[PDB]
Amino acid sequence: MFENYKLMSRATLIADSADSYSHFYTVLKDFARKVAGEDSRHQIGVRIDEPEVDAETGIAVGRGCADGEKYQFTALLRENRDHNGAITIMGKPMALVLD
Amino acid sequence: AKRRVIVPIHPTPNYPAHFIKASFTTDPLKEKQKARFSSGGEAMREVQMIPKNLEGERSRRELMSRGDTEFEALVEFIQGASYDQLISGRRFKKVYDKLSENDDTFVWLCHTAMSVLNPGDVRSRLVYNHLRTLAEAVANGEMTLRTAFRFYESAVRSPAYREIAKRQMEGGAATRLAGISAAADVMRRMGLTRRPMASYFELYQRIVERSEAMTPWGFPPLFQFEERLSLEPRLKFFSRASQQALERRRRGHIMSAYTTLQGRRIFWIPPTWNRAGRFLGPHVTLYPGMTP
Amino acid sequence: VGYTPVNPDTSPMLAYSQYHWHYNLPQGMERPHGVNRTMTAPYQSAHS
Amino acid sequence: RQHDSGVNQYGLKPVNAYDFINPTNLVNFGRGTSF
Amino acid sequence: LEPRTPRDWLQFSYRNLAYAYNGALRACQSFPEMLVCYKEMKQRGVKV
Amino acid sequence: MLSQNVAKTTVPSYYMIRTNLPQRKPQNQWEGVYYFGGITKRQRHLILL
Amino acid sequence: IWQRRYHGPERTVGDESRRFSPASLRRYIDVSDPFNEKKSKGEHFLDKYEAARTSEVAAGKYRTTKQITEIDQWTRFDVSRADNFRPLSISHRRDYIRLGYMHRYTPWEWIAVQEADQPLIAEQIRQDNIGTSYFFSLNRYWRYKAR
Amino acid sequence: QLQSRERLILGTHGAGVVQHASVSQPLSVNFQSSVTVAAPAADLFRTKVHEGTGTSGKDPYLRTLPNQE
Amino acid sequence: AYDMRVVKFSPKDHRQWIYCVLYVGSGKGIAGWGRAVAPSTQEAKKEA
Amino acid sequence: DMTVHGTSLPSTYRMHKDINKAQRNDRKLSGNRFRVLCSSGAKKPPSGWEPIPDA
Amino acid sequence: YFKPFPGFRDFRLNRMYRDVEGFSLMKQRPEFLEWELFTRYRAHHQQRR
Amino acid sequence: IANALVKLLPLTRIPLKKSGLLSVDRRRERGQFPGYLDGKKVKRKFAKR
Amino acid sequence: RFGNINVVEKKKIPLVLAQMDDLGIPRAHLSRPLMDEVEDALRKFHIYKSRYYEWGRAVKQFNFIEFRRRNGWMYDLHLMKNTTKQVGPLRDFNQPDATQAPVATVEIPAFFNERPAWEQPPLEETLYVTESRERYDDVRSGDIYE
Amino acid sequence: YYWSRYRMPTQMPKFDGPAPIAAPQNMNSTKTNEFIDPIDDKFPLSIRGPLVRPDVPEDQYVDSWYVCTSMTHHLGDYRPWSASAPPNAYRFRPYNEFDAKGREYVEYM
RNA sequence: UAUUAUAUUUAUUCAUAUAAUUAAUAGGAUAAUAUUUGUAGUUUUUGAUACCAUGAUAAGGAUUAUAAAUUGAAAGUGUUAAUAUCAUAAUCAAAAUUUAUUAUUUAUAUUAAAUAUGUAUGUGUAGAUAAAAUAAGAAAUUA
RNA sequence: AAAAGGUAUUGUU
């Protein structure tokens, strides 16, 4: 509603006030279509972003946290075209990190 | 008693008589009681419903340059969706009253159309003029709802009235279409509304909604219109809240009455450390979630 | 309030209230106090 | 008008002598009074 | 409606705008106006 | 005798003990510190001589 | 960089003058698309199925365009607006305090008062031509000694 | 690169935004009637360094360019 | 004649509701009388 | 005090005591005591100064 | 100035910057496409630079 | 890791969103408090007269 | 309004003397008339760390105060001035409903929000001595400094 | 005196009103919180959302002293989220490339 | 009825005060001159005290909630702003338990820095009692 | 969650 009001102008307000219901429809127009329309056009399924990967470096830098203070890590996740699996934590092999 | 003495605070340059007399009392049988309120510049006018006493040119300038008050109220309500403002129940309620201004005339004319068995020929200009003049003076406050309805049902219609009726009506209660057409004509001839279709719409919908009630056309004469003791507006008869009929649902914390400020509560009167035990503010969030 | 009084130089309630300057008004310099320049005393010391 | 006529901006409106001598009655009617 | 605070960003992407412009056109009935709604779907950078 | 030596303290009252008003002027911030640079009448006569 | 002006952040591009408007305050700006992104720059192959201007009753751009004055308001913040530079003097500012103004930057004049009214300490100059005195300066007089 | 700057930004007193060549004559609108017609600039008056009288642009109500070099 | 009647907004809270009687008349024919209860002198006067 | 005012003023607490003296010796008397730092001048007034007996 | 985020060049007023010192085509009001060609030639002199 | 993979291949967001790997447990300990014997939860012994 | 500013262009003078000492031009090899103003400037804007460690002495403050006193000047001084006339604001015709109330106070000088040179009577240093004195009779509402 | 700076240029607010609408005036057993706005709070969240101060870059607010509130250093003059970002900035990012930890680490590499 | 769960877990040995005088300003080098180097009128009052001497901020969970949110409140708990008229009680070391309102270290290794607790082995053991649904992981009898 | 009295008139000390 607010934004439909915003899209109006001085001239169009002055105009569509002479009908004296025109402007209430100009504003509530989406609400009119709602209250009379037994439908939700809107079920926006899931947000699906763009890839933000360090171009030269081939890394994704993703943040993560636990307890908000005591654990705050970041994954540098890199694409590996040679099938050589390897997971690293704090600069050391993951098995020897995570015991 | 270890009796307490309070020397009366006398007015000063700094501490005026009004404050020193209401913010302070020298008789300590009222100490630590509670916080009173009162209304000033615009709160007083908002509550007291004192209409501006008009004038000529100046009040008419302020009054002519009004424009569609109902809309401008709506503008002011929505604008709380902008970045620098919040949507406020006070704005919504100024909208709600600027839209429900013509509650009196509407509840009346609905009573007239639908609670008056056999109202003459309302479309006949005689009873139509009774109707026009009564509803005209029901708005404009000169008449009450109750007295005006009695003036309606008592106005002079036609001689040998029962005898003309028992010829046209079996059980006496005529068709209501002439009545409601007359009332919509009433409120569209008298500019009770700025936006015309509104008159008819309320006149129509209030009737439709009542059509569902048991004894949907009897009203206990006391509660029916204004009197001393009335019904809550959800329970009024041709009123706008009667469809807003619902109720609340509460799961209180183990500690729910203590935290009466902790939530994301709008504060009109902000806390200060003298009453505020450990409260931090309505914006702080001790348990934050990570998010872009 | 008290015999051991308020001190107008440390206390935020005083320094901030309407008879002083609040922290959210832009705390600038209000007027430049040139005092040692309008008429400077002569140098006269107790100790000769 | 704009408000109901059985109340004043101070409470209930006093009608008869009882209300005017005992104005508790206008602003208090049980542990669940609300304006 | 665009995002004006980083909250609306969370419910926002052009590839999601696609499923919704499709709601627009699947509910639309004439091609002379599916013309303008497809014109807008291509003009706003909707990931087709 | 002198005018500007007007009362900066009030009539010694109980509004000192009962109210938070400041019994002394709040220190200014943009005031310099008062030093003495100045030559007397005799001292200026000496330099001119 | 070949500066073209001594001041602006990007000196290295010119000053493209723009067309004057005799309707200087009478311009208009569509706001559903401020930047004119909704326009045809070339006739399309989908231009043919176009239903005419019939029933296109309220061509939304014509009812979204605003005259320019409308988008922003000159509110009391703008009527007490504080400057974005060091003002040379605000003596004229008869709207100084009662009307609700406070400068964003102390004016040059009162900075000059605040510089003048007070001295300069001799230990702010740090002149030096002799060097460090290896033997005496530390065993200098027991009063002016380096504790 | 402001055009004719040597007469506009440098030597036009009021920076080219202020219009000096006018009177205090009264016009019947409520805005321009608030300004009384001022009897002209004194013939032989020795005026100050910053203030003129306001007859022309070069002799404006407040001279703008400094006396500095 | 003004009066004062204690008003008990609660068991713990009591107010002094001054109670006015007054008659607003003009011998030109028209005269009414109102009595009121209100917490203050001038507010009870206006109410009456 | 001698610079901004003339006199050297007491504490707020002292002038409290002194005002209460001023007033509780206005409405009534005969409750006081005479505690001094030095008594030689009270036990031994000057050549004159014969104090007044009240009533 | 009156669009989203006017770049810093868009707060300074419509002052007569000298790049209209030379264009003998447009006299005082550039006629149809006159301004568009003058701006194309602003581009041309910029490619010149 | 979940945000790393959403950032490297976006359309993998949807399984990650749905599985709740991009979910933040909005949880922390009870802060450090002296009114608690362990600092976190237990209030000191309460005794009636 | 607040002072003769270019008195501050007498601040570099001691730095001028330092750059002299470092250039090898003896300050005693000046003129004595010029050294008059320069010794004045050295006691004006120049201080030694030793005089700075003890120039803010309270009694030094208060002898400046007493000298200004017996020279009859307590207008510029902080303690010894009493500004009892606190200026009011321009009321607004557009908002006549709000009981306007303050956000701050400052003891600014009186020329800022002044009744203009025509809205006040003609010269009042001479013809109309204005004094805002306190009433001896009690005033509850109404200023104390009439 | 030094008590005369503590003077005043209006006339006061006069206590000539009744309690505003829905003010918590104490009836018998109403647990009273004087602070909460009586309307704007009970106005449902399904409408109003959990905003208690404008959605606007938090560096515009300052936490008040002594008052459990938060006020803006510029006295209520606001600049929206989109003034704290480049034009059309994606998620109002500093540079539309990466987030807070993406920037620093692209930079380290 | 619905807008939705306490019957589980971990707990109980608890203590520290001492040796009387609160009444005021007094500028010092690199400054055009004060011995003001070293500024000498005693003794007319009395409350915050060992003693009556008003006010003003804590502890305490039992039904405003689920989403983008916190499981801590006003009813005032010693020191505080107008009642006077018993007495100096105030830490500069080394100190005297009766005060309800307290989480102690549990059997491989036991005194080094202002000195630093020598008592109570006992079948986890009477009675009544403590805490908690919060980054931990709990599940079913509403007024 | 819903209905309750006073010889008291800050009112069961």
Tab-separated table of C-alpha atoms in Angstrom, chain A residues 3 6 41 44-49, chain E residues 1 9-13 15-16 20:
chain	number	residue	atom	x	y	z
A	3	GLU	CA	4.577	1.958	-2.224
A	6	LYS	CA	4.495	6.582	-3.442
A	41	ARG	CA	0.240	-15.390	-5.833
A	44	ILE	CA	8.397	-17.603	-3.140
A	45	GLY	CA	10.055	-20.956	-2.768
A	46	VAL	CA	13.702	-20.479	-1.847
A	47	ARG	CA	16.248	-17.772	-2.433
A	48	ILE	CA	18.926	-18.919	-4.890
A	49	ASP	CA	21.997	-16.702	-5.025
E	1	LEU	CA	8.955	-4.913	-4.894
E	9	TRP	CA	17.252	-9.149	0.190
E	10	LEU	CA	16.749	-12.451	1.974
E	11	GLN	CA	13.521	-13.127	0.071
E	12	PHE	CA	14.975	-11.956	-3.214
E	13	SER	CA	16.557	-13.248	-6.406
E	15	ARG	CA	15.718	-16.718	-10.583
E	16	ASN	CA	12.915	-16.684	-8.003
E	20	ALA	CA	6.519	-15.515	-10.112
